[PDB]
Design a protein around this ligand. Structure first.
Ligand SMILES: *[C@@H]1O[C@H](CO)[C@@H](O[C@@H]2O[C@H](CO)[C@@H](O[C@H]3O[C@H](CO)[C@@H](O)[C@H](O)[C@@H]3O)[C@H](O)[C@H]2NC(C)=O)[C@H](O)[C@H]1NC(C)=O
Ligand SMILES: *[C@@H]1O[C@H](CO)[C@@H](O[C@@H]2O[C@H](CO)[C@@H](O[C@H]3O[C@H](CO)[C@@H](O)[C@H](O)[C@@H]3O)[C@H](O)[C@H]2NC(C)=O)[C@H](O)[C@H]1NC(C)=O
Ligand SMILES: *[C@@H]1O[C@H](CO)[C@@H](O[C@@H]2O[C@H](CO)[C@@H](O[C@H]3O[C@H](CO)[C@@H](O)[C@H](O)[C@@H]3O)[C@H](O)[C@H]2NC(C)=O)[C@H](O)[C@H]1NC(C)=O
Ligand SMILES: *[C@@H]1O[C@H](CO)[C@@H](O[C@@H]2O[C@H](CO)[C@@H](O)[C@H](O)[C@H]2NC(C)=O)[C@H](O)[C@H]1NC(C)=O
Ligand SMILES: *[C@@H]1O[C@H](CO)[C@@H](O[C@@H]2O[C@H](CO)[C@@H](O)[C@H](O)[C@H]2NC(C)=O)[C@H](O)[C@H]1NC(C)=O
Ligand SMILES: *[C@@H]1O[C@H](CO)[C@@H](O[C@@H]2O[C@H](CO)[C@@H](O)[C@H](O)[C@H]2NC(C)=O)[C@H](O)[C@H]1NC(C)=O
Ligand SMILES: *[C@@H]1O[C@H](CO)[C@@H](O)[C@H](O)[C@H]1NC(C)=O
Ligand SMILES: *[C@@H]1O[C@H](CO)[C@@H](O)[C@H](O)[C@H]1NC(C)=O
Ligand SMILES: *[C@@H]1O[C@H](CO)[C@@H](O)[C@H](O)[C@H]1NC(C)=O
Ligand SMILES: *[C@@H]1O[C@H](CO)[C@@H](O)[C@H](O)[C@H]1NC(C)=O
Ligand SMILES: *[C@@H]1O[C@H](CO)[C@@H](O)[C@H](O)[C@H]1NC(C)=O
Ligand SMILES: *[C@@H]1O[C@H](CO)[C@@H](O)[C@H](O)[C@H]1NC(C)=O
Ligand SMILES: *[C@@H]1O[C@H](CO)[C@@H](O)[C@H](O)[C@H]1NC(C)=O
Ligand SMILES: *[C@@H]1O[C@H](CO)[C@@H](O)[C@H](O)[C@H]1NC(C)=O
Ligand SMILES: *[C@@H]1O[C@H](CO)[C@@H](O)[C@H](O)[C@H]1NC(C)=O
Ligand SMILES: *[C@@H]1O[C@H](CO)[C@@H](O)[C@H](O)[C@H]1NC(C)=O
Ligand SMILES: *[C@@H]1O[C@H](CO)[C@@H](O)[C@H](O)[C@H]1NC(C)=O
Ligand SMILES: *[C@@H]1O[C@H](CO)[C@@H](O)[C@H](O)[C@H]1NC(C)=O
Ligand SMILES: *[C@H]1O[C@H](CO)[C@@H](O)[C@H](O)[C@H]1NC(C)=O
Ligand SMILES: *[C@H]1O[C@H](CO)[C@@H](O)[C@H](O)[C@H]1NC(C)=O
Ligand SMILES: *[C@H]1O[C@H](CO)[C@@H](O)[C@H](O)[C@H]1NC(C)=O
Lengths: 491, 491, 491
């Protein structure tokens, strides 16, 4: 009657979410946000990276100049996309260390080609084949020059091309392995012999090996492809007596952020920074479980399919009914703040949100969101992470490196979220405790702690009086005489 | 006389253990558990993984079919164990990229072999040697076919074997390098010439090189071993004019969780999930310092030989003697709880454990144990981590990858244990503080804090009264008049 | 008048430093220390590691014995330093897998060479060239022996060298590729043919390839360099009919902590444990941003250029003026302690530092400094991390491994510093709170909390009385009657 009650409390919601902390495997909080990206739209967005869709062509087919790849001449990319349907449709070939040539062209990001005038005096140039049709005519790789005898002579070639440019030159060349001794003589006028391609700093010698291989598009012969990089001030020398598939010039070789990806995802007219083989993915979240193959500003790949970051305090049911405070009890009816006051006095029972404490909690949570959301880092050309052939040692190491990396990031992600969630529970608990302590200090000897998050105020404390406490302007001296008389009375 | 004392406290033990936290390099707690496995039984348990003990045979010798390895035909394994005593006892051979063939067969996990009928018309089959005895008779590798001239002719071989199966085929074949020109002619009727083994997608040409090597089991010649994998719908073509050591068929090549390990540990009849070269190790702990080479569900390798996880609160000696509470003081005599009450009243001096607070602490500690104990993850075929030969670049990278991984896990382990131990000290301190605070709130104006973890209760508080406080049913109003009179009296 | 005031507080400084914690991106503390080393002196200190400055010689040139490298014979190193100005000045050569031979010699750490007496009966030894002058005379690599015909005969060589030592032998040898058929005959009396160098466990066959390469120091021919390691109990066999560049003996091959580094930094007479290409760096700090290439006891490379570790409490401005305590308020005038007391009584206004709380904070901060400062770990030979040529697959993997490692350490560093800084703020806040709580408990019913970190003491409390509180010897009973009368009076 001659007293009032003031309770300190916090909000609660009817639909909380479970998160993990250091203390609890499962604790319900008022709200959380997902930190693992697990979906893609399923398309690769054509912006803001320059995409080159290989369609039916591998990068190596586009490099050599398979007729169906003619439209790729001189093009550049940030990301070359190779399709599973891609197929070769020219003379059958192989590339010793195919993976390396693919990688180095991919990383260079350009098919720019400059023709050069080699001196092929004494031989027939521009050999063609029915296995490599261009506009329904017998043809050959656009960037290569099939040399054969002239008037049944093939004089020894000893041909030079200096690099007088200020940039490196990439030369692609080949050796023809004929199916039979008959074809060797028919083509090069004499028995097969080695090809030597050299510079001041390197030498490569290749021996043609005559023999039938299983027919590919009806051809039992093969071309083996080689490459040579020539520095400024160095000189290419080509030395051969037959079987040379000659370069027509050089590719520019650049450095930058280009790569290549295997994917069947359609290319869309849209804008997304992070590309995976499954399609582009949003990069707001710090982690993702879509694909360990990525290009661009991407979330880091982890094994988890979900990691929930708490964005609110512990969610605690309201106890069924006298008003009561935060001790084992949240307030579902408090909707305009996270913390606040309930009172009972001469004028009724009321509630008010505390703005300061609410904002302190929200600001800290927004702070950690700002550290974690929209802060992905870019990666470009990396290592391959899926393999179509069995290879042993090198592949074992590539796979182990990647597995090692993923487990370490998955661990970091698990620990980070547990630590942050513990900190969020701690900081939100702390704001409640601080509010209660501040109030206790204001009240001095005029109130007692009832043990339920409420004070029994031992004087008449009307709406303005309660407001003075909430506003931090309550003068304990004004009421102390009244309060002491009420507290320390014999009953 | 007209008062009582109620002290809040916690247990202590005479034999505490030192752990590390974020705050302290060394702090004594009541109990701890070891998180680094540092011993092995010294034997490899034959369950639950399928173990194949190579005995005197390497995997490659068992593959080729060295007579002493005949018992291995067609066997499978999860883990092939190669012994240091193993030795070859057939024709001397080498394998270019031995490590890769070993790895790929190891990972495949099967020696299943299917014979095929190759057409070797025109040559003598089944050549043998005194260097490869089988049942005291001259013999040869079981899976290989040594072809030699027939009637002093060796017609050119051009032999095909299509893969019309729905699975890949692994072919193992070889080239014989004779010791002398005499042996070349004696065996193959003509001067040495290249061997070409091809498919639609690959080609391998090998040149026999005649010459003496140092004698091995009295043989100066050598066989070099090669392999070819043939896909469904592809075709093996073998083309040769001498020196061919032919396949008799193909190996199945499978994918799964198989590997190979070098170890001299005996195989025992027992059951253990984690295998190391030192023997099987228990996998209850999250870390281990036994060996960085592992197979199965294993603790992670770290450099530390011990990491102790606190499983109890700070251990604090009892001060020598009036009762006293937890302030700089533990209770060795409290044995039925971790926290509790001591009192002095009209009826004597008593102690009671507080079950709730004790269980809260124990449950949280059991929670972190459940996260850390018995939760190891499986790894299977990885990379090699010990090397018998000097190799340079590739080996440097294999070693660096592993060193990198171990240092990162060792760091994670060190930080994890420090963080968890800090949290355990914090949570156990917290339960003590909470118990004291709850009691303070119950007592209201009827008691004062004596500063030593005890309350001076300013009314007669008999055994039932004390029990009411411990049980949370104490009604402060019943005693308030008495208590206020005693507290606020002029003396 | 009949009362006193006692305030609890902590120091503040006029020049605080901003650090990052888990709670705050930016919080000012009284002091911090830098954990990332970002400068070098710019010189490589010649102590305590044994440094070998290659000057104009690569390690491989010093190994082969280019005349300008004669002074390097038989020398050892912990770190061989290769200079960008280095150049070859003998016969032009290449080394297939140059990187591996460089690495394995580097890691071995010795050029110790033992001559052996090979039986080269039937040929001319010690061939020389004007391209390799020694003391103005035609010469050749010191460790190699250029064999040519004798009286226009080159008999087949078949030469043996057993390893009867208890250590491994490293043999370096070569093949001469002549510029023309004329030179082949002039030098070796017959058409070129293979060289085979073998042991019981290995074989290497190399084919000389006649032809012009672009002239290097006027020479169109080349030597290709090979190596063979021979175990105890094994035997080297060299078999050749021309073009052999023979070994004169063997190199010791050792194991230990040696490496090689590319750097143009001058060598100084000074002592530093950590070497980078930029020069030696101090190793007090746990991290560094100078270079990811390191040798010795070095801080770990991270991407951050600064990480500041808090070494003091939150720095909080003093509020402008009655004395006041720590609530939103630090004391710039407290200079002999971190925490303490201010009082107002009958005898004036005074301040005293609290030694215990100050020392508790300082000891804990010194503890974490001792864990982090001067505790670097040693690494020696690793992998290469900069590349002068484009190579593809292997280089992609080397770069990815290193990028992976650096990002993981950079993450660990960021989290470590945030966690430690949070802990430092927490522990320093805690000492303040504990001091306030201890004081509150001493005062019992004789004082009230004014809400600003101060107590109103309700009795006359002169300088000695205040001292008794600070010293922990205050007897509340002495003053309780006076204090209760003053507190609970009607006004
Ligand atoms: C070595 O053996 C090879 C496999 O037996 C063989 O290749 C096969 O050659 C035949 C006959 O030339 C091809 O069959 C083709 O014959 C008719 C001719 O009218 C064509 O119109 C058809 O396209 C038909 O396919 C096979 O296609 C071919 N098989 C493979 C797997 O390539 C080689 O010719 C033999 N080598 C030598 C030098 O004789
Ligand atoms: C090239 O030189 C090789 C090493 O000198 C040589 O190998 C050696 O050959 C001898 C003689 O054949 C072997 O000695 C064996 O001789 C008796 C003959 O009754 C045997 O009963 C014994 O087993 C005895 O060991 C050596 O073992 C052998 N040494 C090595 C290291 O292999 C080659 O024969 C020479 N090559 C040519 C083509 O002549
Ligand atoms: C294959 O072609 C090569 C390049 O055209 C050629 O090498 C060049 O040879 C010429 C002439 O021998 C050298 O020129 C030198 O000639 C005078 C002779 O008095 C010297 O005094 C000078 O040093 C002058 O440089 C070139 O230096 C050389 N070019 C290169 C790039 O090496 C080969 O000789 C040809 N091979 C064959 C077998 O004929
Ligand atoms: C590299 O080119 C040279 C020519 O510049 C070739 O050498 C000639 O070879 C023919 C027969 O093949 C001989 O009749 C000539 O006498 C050689 N000329 C000279 C100047 O020596 C050489 O064969 C070529 N090498 C290769 C591997 O193709
Ligand atoms: C691959 O097989 C073919 C036969 O199918 C070999 O070619 C024959 O070689 C002999 C002499 O070696 C010649 O007399 C024949 O004229 C060739 N036959 C045909 C049909 O061309 C060939 O030598 C084999 N290749 C290898 C590398 O062993
Ligand atoms: C390895 O050495 C042997 C000699 O020990 C060489 O074999 C001789 O070769 C010549 C002609 O080159 C023949 O006239 C002899 O009959 C051979 N001697 C014997 C004992 O067989 C052989 O050529 C050498 N090999 C190489 C690759 O150089
Ligand atoms: C939950 O948290 C997120 C992140 O702060 C916020 O965007 C979202 O609106 C919140 N949801 C509710 C219902 O408050
Ligand atoms: C790719 O090849 C397929 C199959 O021949 C063909 O139908 C399609 O038109 C080709 N696409 C392009 C873009 O050339
Ligand atoms: C992405 O593709 C990979 C590889 O095919 C597949 O494992 C994964 O389920 C895909 N993820 C999504 C979200 O589509
Ligand atoms: C602010 O303080 C005044 C003065 O005591 C008080 O009457 C008023 O109700 C307060 N306003 C609030 C709590 O909104
Ligand atoms: C110490 O802790 C472990 C793990 O909880 C427990 O199994 C063991 O019994 C404890 N020892 C004692 C003496 O309490
Ligand atoms: C392995 O070889 C040794 C030495 O010859 C022999 O004593 C032993 O019986 C062999 N073991 C088996 C299982 O064949
Ligand atoms: C296991 O074997 C390794 C390699 O021989 C050795 O370094 C280590 O001491 C062994 N550990 C134990 C516990 O036996
Ligand atoms: C439980 O509460 C009752 C009622 O006050 C009390 O008398 C009794 O002793 C308590 N039991 C305990 C503490 O075991
Ligand atoms: C700041 O901290 C460092 C590390 O403890 C200490 O050496 C230095 O003297 C301190 N500076 C000041 C001004 O206290
Ligand atoms: C290194 O070579 C340069 C350029 O020829 C020369 O001037 C210098 O004397 C050489 N230095 C040494 C130490 O031989
Ligand atoms: C060290 O050298 C590297 C490579 O040249 C350079 O990136 C870096 O800026 C240098 N750092 C310092 C502190 O000199
Ligand atoms: C220590 O305690 C004594 C006894 O009460 C007190 O008078 C004295 O001032 C204290 N000394 C201090 C605080 O330095
Ligand atoms: C092929 O070479 C001929 C000369 O035989 C030349 O005229 C023509 O330009 C070449 N074809 C090209 C460049 O497409
Ligand atoms: C070896 O070939 C012969 C024919 O020369 C054949 O009869 C026999 O089965 C073969 N030996 C085997 C399969 O062990
Ligand atoms: C080169 O060989 C000759 C014999 O022709 C020998 O006398 C001399 O010692 C050798 N030169 C050396 C070892 O420098």
């Amino acid at each position: 009657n001659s007293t009032a009650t003031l309770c300190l409390g916090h909000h609660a919601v009817p639909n909380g979410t479970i998160v993990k902390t250091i203390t609890n495997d499962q604790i319900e909080v008022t709200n959380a946000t997902e930190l693992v990206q697990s979906s893609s739209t399923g398309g690769i967005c054509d912006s803001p990276h320059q995409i080159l869709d290989g369609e039916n062509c591998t990068l190596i087919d586009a490099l050599l100049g398979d007729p169906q790849c003619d439209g790729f001449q001189n093009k550049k990319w940030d990301l070359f996309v190779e399709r599973s349907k891609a197929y070769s449709n020219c003379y059958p070939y192989d590339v010793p260390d195919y993976a390396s040539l693919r990688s180095l062209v991919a990383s260079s990001g350009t098919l720019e080609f400059n023709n050069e005038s080699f001196n092929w005096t004494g031989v027939t140039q521009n050999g063609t084949s029915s296995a490599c049709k261009r506009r329904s005519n017998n043809s050959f790789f656009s960037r290569l020059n099939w040399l054969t005898h002239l008037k049944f002579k093939y004089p020894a070639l000893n041909v030079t091309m200096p690099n007088n440019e200020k940039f490196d030159k990439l030369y692609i060349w080949g050796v023809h392995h004929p199916g039979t001794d008959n074809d060797q003589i028919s083509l090069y006028a004499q028995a097969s012999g080695r090809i030597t391609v050299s510079t001041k700093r390197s030498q490569q010698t290749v021996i043609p090996n005559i023999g039938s291989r299983p027919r590919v598009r009806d051809i039992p012969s093969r071309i083996s492809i080689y490459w040579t990089i020539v520095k400024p001030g160095d000189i290419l020398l080509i030395n051969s007596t037959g079987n040379l598939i000659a370069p027509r010039g050089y590719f520019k070789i650049r450095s930058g952020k280009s790569s290549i990806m295997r994917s069947d995802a359609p290319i869309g007219k849209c804008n997304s920074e992070c590309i995976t083989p499954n399609g582009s993915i949003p990069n707001d979240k710090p982690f993702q479980n879509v694909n360990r193959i990525t290009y661009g500003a991407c979330p880091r790949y982890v094994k988890q399919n979900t990691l929930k970051l708490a964005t609110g305090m512990r969610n605690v049911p309201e106890k069924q009914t006298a008003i009561a405070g935060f001790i084992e009890n949240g307030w579902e009816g408090m909707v305009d703040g996270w913390y606040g006051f309930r009172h009972q006095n001469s004028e009724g029972i009321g509630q008010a949100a505390d703005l300061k404490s609410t904002q302190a909690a929200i600001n800290q949570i927004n702070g950690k969101l700002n550290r974690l959301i929209g802060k992905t880092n870019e990666k470009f050309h990396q290592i391959e992470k899926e393999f179509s052939e069995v290879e042993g040692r090198i592949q074992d190491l590539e796979k182990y490196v990647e597995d090692t990396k993923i487990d370490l990031w998955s661990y970091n992600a698990e620990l980070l979220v547990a630590l942050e969630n513990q900190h969020t529970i701690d900081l939100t608990d702390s704001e409640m405790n601080k509010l209660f302590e501040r109030t206790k200090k204001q009240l001095r000897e005029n109130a007692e702690d009832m043990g339920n998050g409420c004070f029994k105020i031992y004087h008449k404390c009307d709406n303005a009086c309660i407001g003075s406490i909430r506003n931090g302007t309550y003068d304990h001296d004004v009421y102390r005489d009244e309060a002491l008389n009420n507290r320390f009375q014999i009953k």
